[PDB]
Write a protein that binds this ligand. Structure first.
Ligand SMILES: *[C@@H]1O[C@H](CO[C@@H]2O[C@@H](C)[C@@H](O)[C@@H](O)[C@@H]2O)[C@@H](O[C@@H]2O[C@H](CO)[C@@H](O[C@@H]3O[C@H](CO[C@H]4O[C@H](CO)[C@@H](O)[C@H](O)[C@@H]4O)[C@@H](O)[C@H](O[C@H]4O[C@H](CO)[C@@H](O)[C@H](O)[C@@H]4O)[C@@H]3O)[C@H](O)[C@H]2NC(C)=O)[C@H](O)[C@H]1NC(C)=O
Ligand code: N57
Ligand code: PLM
Ligand code: NAG
Ligand code: NAG
Lengths: 98, 239, 201, 267
């Protein structure tokens, strides 16, 4: 069993009001059964795109969730991940820089 | 690469425990139990990949299986039923694709054993008219009054079973074609050269192996217990 | 039912050839085996075909397999009496022990024997331990003759049956009739027997 | 000098339930996918069929379709053969394909992993375990090697069909493989840790440094390559600094898309 590492980052440079895409990259986990949700202000974002699952040279899995988003002053975004390896869901929040 | 089964033939009552066994000295890891029913092909009941493993096959309902060792794989009918009347084949194999088949085991499951009866055997001696007209002598043997129909009729000459010159009826015929559990009769012929029959040192013998009750089957009737037995008739040659 | 055989049964005179069919839907198809089951006995292997377009022989038995068509035939050249049997088709879906075998129902061959020199007769045989009881034996008739069931129920007549004295290369049909209630001249009244039958005595 | 990869992932939860999902890469670009739900392999590029005819692809796809069903049952049967030694949940992973070298040259691989641990490979004319593998696999190996039909096919796939096919792809997908997309960069911060973000660049090789004048700040910590959805890449370089020491600092970025004119962002 292996823990997932999560990384939240935007496609284009973050400007308030301007449309964009928010990527969430989940890696180095085993087994491959995983639940991923991208959050806005706590609430689950409805139309989230998921890449096909794959794995690296060390047989550990990875996957890329992404979704359109428009960053603001007020709104915070996040990526929540449930896995058999972890006791409760892990949430990393978007840094506002990435 | 040989395989053996036991019993080769079995009569059982509904509700009885019946156990079919299969021995293999091949050191084959894998063993298989099938049943053949006129109409279908062989269908897999259970199988085993080594001592201690047993797997459900295609039609496993009603059969428990047992692999105590590498050599023996058993099929257990805990509560026998009429639907389990069949011919049961056993087979073994190594890591490759071949399965080496056993000789088969016939099982008849009856509703009740009340009508079970062994045969009377008669041996009828060659006609002098036949001896002179053809230079050949036809012995004829006659198993009668037996139920159920599980019998093996064999011919023996000076203690050694003869196959050449034999014919046995394909199926036994009913004494009482009307009745539900009628008794049967079965004929067989052995034809030899007239000089072989005229030689008075040739001992001819017709033997009927009757399969019936085990020594652990209950018997509430007055008559002799109709057990799995041999009945035979015998004749010497004469010039 | 992923393995079908044709014909279901067939009757042929000794000496004739015959082709047995086997078509299957099994996937994948590693190999195809033809078995031979004598009445009563178990499974004797004849051949195993393993290639996309394969052919084999085993004396008088020869066979083919086309895996694109998913079809196999078994030819028997110059049938003999011993060929009277059921012929089973079996497809294995792996080339290892991991696979399952899918069995066909079987084609039932029956071979009529070739009686060269008939000499039809009805003899009377006597019991060894008890002279009073006896049987009437109808023997030496060619395979054109059909032995008919008994007119009476208290009289018993068996069906015909062929023996083979292998050391003399001699075959003969025979049938037995008997009754407690009866004589051998009147025993086979109900069968259309040869008009030149030899009732002795 | 490209590498072709067929990654297969198979989960067996219990004796009845299972699933097998594949994906196919050529370098860092996805060329195929094959979900458990799909009965047929899906292209993820226009050029994914390569230089194969439609009828060649059909006979190849049908081989895989049949393999996938056969693969599942065989694993399930190998669990029965080994039990109680092993039982579910079981996670088998394959990695197969070939690497392409200039001229005629190529090597083929087929590596199998059990519960995330490389244990078996196809090599020469047979399956064999690797160093580290537990010794119980010896029986599974013995059984798989009995299947002389499977060996001949896998040999043909590794030796011929794969290296041939990949040459088809390389010619057929030149413009996508040799594509040049430009990075976009931006600055930010969180002692203080400045961060230089770069994104949208292809291919993967890129140079990213913090600078004061012509002097490379050797404190620069380079991050990992993270993928964007549009088949480009992302990468950030961070540098620790004293508060109020951000003046004079610039992020310089070189990439083959830019052609001489490098991106420089000043603070
Ligand atoms: C496909 O390519 C195979 C090799 O390619 C590698 O494996 C594939 C799957 C990919 O991973 C690819 O990227 C790799 O490059 C090729 O395998 C070769 O097959 C031949 C025979 O078919 C093998 O020859 C036999 O070798 C044994 C002994 O070999 C040992 O020692 C050598 C050291 O030199 C080691 O490298 C091996 O691993 C072995 O441990 C011989 O004893 C044997 O000789 C006997 O039989 C021949 C007749 O066939 C007689 O001439 C002799 O007198 C003997 O009676 C064989 O010669 C060869 O080992 C094997 N190579 C490797 C590297 O394993 C395969 O044939 C190709 N298949 C097709 C269909 O094209
Ligand atoms: C718990 C045990 C861990 C097991 C690890 C083993 C890893 C090996 C996994 C790859 C094995 C290959 C799987 C498929 C193979 O076994 C066959 O089932 C498949 N190739 C079908 O083969 C049959 O059909 C073929 C025609 O395409 C041939 O006729 C072949 O002979 C036949 O077996
Ligand atoms: C070129 C597109 C292929 C897509 C599907 C590939 C996923 C499986 C990769 C592993 C191949 C294993 C080879 C075994 C073949 C066989 O035994 O028939
Ligand atoms: C097998 O596992 C699946 C998913 O983990 C579950 O939904 C299913 O109920 C299980 N089946 C059995 C027969 O236990
Ligand atoms: C995967 O596909 C097979 C048939 O292709 C199906 O029987 C099985 O239930 C599928 N499993 C899941 C979890 O979807």
């Amino acid at each position: 069993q292996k823990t997932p590492q999560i990384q939240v980052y935007s496609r284009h440079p973050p400007e308030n009001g301007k449309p964009n895409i928010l990527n969430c990259y989940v890696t180095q986990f085993h087994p491959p059964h995983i639940e991923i949700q991208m959050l806005k202000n706590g609430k689950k974002i409805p139309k989230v795109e998921m890449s096909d699952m794959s794995f690296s040279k060390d047989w550990s899995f990875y996957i890329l969730a992404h979704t359109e988003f428009t960053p603001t002053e007020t709104d915070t975004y996040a990526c929540r991940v449930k896995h058999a390896s972890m006791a409760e869901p892990k949430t990393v929040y978007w840094d506002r820089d990435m | 690469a040989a395989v053996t089964q036991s019993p080769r033939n079995k009569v059982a009552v509904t509700g009885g425990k019946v156990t079919l066994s299969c021995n293999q000295t091949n050191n084959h890891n894998n063993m298989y139990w099938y049943r053949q029913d006129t109409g279908h092909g062989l269908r897999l009941i259970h199988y085993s990949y080594g001592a201690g493993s047993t797997e459900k096959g295609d039609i496993p309902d009603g059969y428990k299986a047992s692999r105590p060792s590498q050599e023996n794989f058993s099929l257990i009918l805990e509560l026998a039923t009429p639907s389990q009347t069949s011919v049961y084949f056993c087979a073994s194999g190594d890591e490759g694709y071949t399965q080496y088949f056993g000789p088969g085991t016939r099982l008849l499951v009856l509703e009740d054993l009340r009508n079970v009866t062994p045969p009377k055997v008669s041996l009828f001696e060659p006609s002098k008219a036949e001896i002179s007209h053809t230079q050949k002598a036809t012995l004829v043997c006659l198993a009668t009054g037996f139920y159920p129909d599980h019998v093996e009729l064999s011919w023996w000459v000076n203690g050694k079973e003869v196959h050449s010159g034999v014919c046995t009826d394909p199926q036994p015929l009913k004494e009482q074609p009307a009745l539900n559990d009628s008794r049967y009769s079965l004929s067989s012929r052995l034809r030899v050269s007239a000089t072989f029959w005229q030689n008075p040192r040739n001992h001819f013998r017709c033997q009927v192996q009757f399969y019936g009750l085990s020594e652990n089957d209950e018997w509430t009737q007055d008559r002799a217990k109709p057990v799995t037995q041999i009945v035979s008739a015998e004749a010497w040659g004469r010039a | 039912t992923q393995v079908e055989q044709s014909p279901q049964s067939l009757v042929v005179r000794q000496g004739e050839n015959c082709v047995l069919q086997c078509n299957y839907s099994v996937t994948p198809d590693n190999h195809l085996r033809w078995f031979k089951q004598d009445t009563g006995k178990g499974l004797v292997s004849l051949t195993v075909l393993v290639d996309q377009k394969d052919k084999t022989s085993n004396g008088r038995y020869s066979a083919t397999l086309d895996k694109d068509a998913k079809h196999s035939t078994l030819h028997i050249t110059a049938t003999l009496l011993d060929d009277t049997a059921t012929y089973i088709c079996v497809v294995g879906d792996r080339g290892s022990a991991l696979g399952r075998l899918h069995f066909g129902a079987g084609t039932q061959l029956i071979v009529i024997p070739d009686i060269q020199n008939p000499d039809p007769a009805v003899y009377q045989l006597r019991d060894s331990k008890s002279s009073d009881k006896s049987v009437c034996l109808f023997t030496d008739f060619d395979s054109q003759t059909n032995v008919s069931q008994s007119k009476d129920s208290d009289v018993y007549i068996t069906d015909k049956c062929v023996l083979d004295m292998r050391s003399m290369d001699f075959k003969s049909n025979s049938a037995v009739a008997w009754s407690n209630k009866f004589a051998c001249a009147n025993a086979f009244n109900n069968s259309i027997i040869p008009e030149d039958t030899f009732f002795p005595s | 000098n490209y590498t072709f990869r067929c990654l297969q992932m198979s989960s067996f939860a219990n004796r009845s339930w299972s699933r097998t999902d594949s994906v196919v890469w050529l370098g860092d670009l996805q060329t195929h996918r094959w979900s458990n739900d799909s009965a047929t392999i899906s292209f993820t590029k226009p050029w994914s069929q390569g230089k194969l005819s439609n009828q060649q692809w059909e006979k190849l796809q049908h081989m895989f379709q049949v393999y996938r069903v056969s693969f599942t049952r065989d694993i399930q049967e190998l669990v029965k053969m080994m039990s109680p030694k092993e039982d579910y949940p079981i996670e088998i992973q394959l990695s197969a394909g070939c690497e392409m070298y200039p001229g005629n040259a190529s090597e083929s691989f087929l590596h199998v992993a059990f519960q995330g641990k490389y244990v078996v490979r196809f090599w020469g004319t047979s399956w064999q375990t690797v160093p580290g593998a537990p010794s119980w696999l010896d029986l599974p190996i013995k059984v798989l090697n009995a299947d002389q039909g499977t060996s001949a096919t896998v040999q043909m796939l590794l030796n011929d069909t794969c290296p041939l096919f990949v040459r088809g792809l390389l010619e057929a997908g030149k413009s996508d493989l040799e594509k040049q997309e430009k990075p976009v960069a931006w600055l930010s911060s969180v002692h203080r840790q400045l961060v230089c973000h770069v994104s949208g660049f292809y291919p993967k090789p890129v140079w990213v440094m913090w600078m004061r004048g012509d002097q490379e700040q050797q404190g620069t910590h380079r991050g990992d390559f993270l993928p964007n959805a549009d088949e480009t890449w992302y990468l950030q370089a961070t540098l620790d600094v004293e508060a109020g020491e951000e003046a004079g600092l610039a992020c310089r970025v070189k990439h083959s898309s830019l052609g001489g004119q490098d991106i420089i962002l000043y603070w």
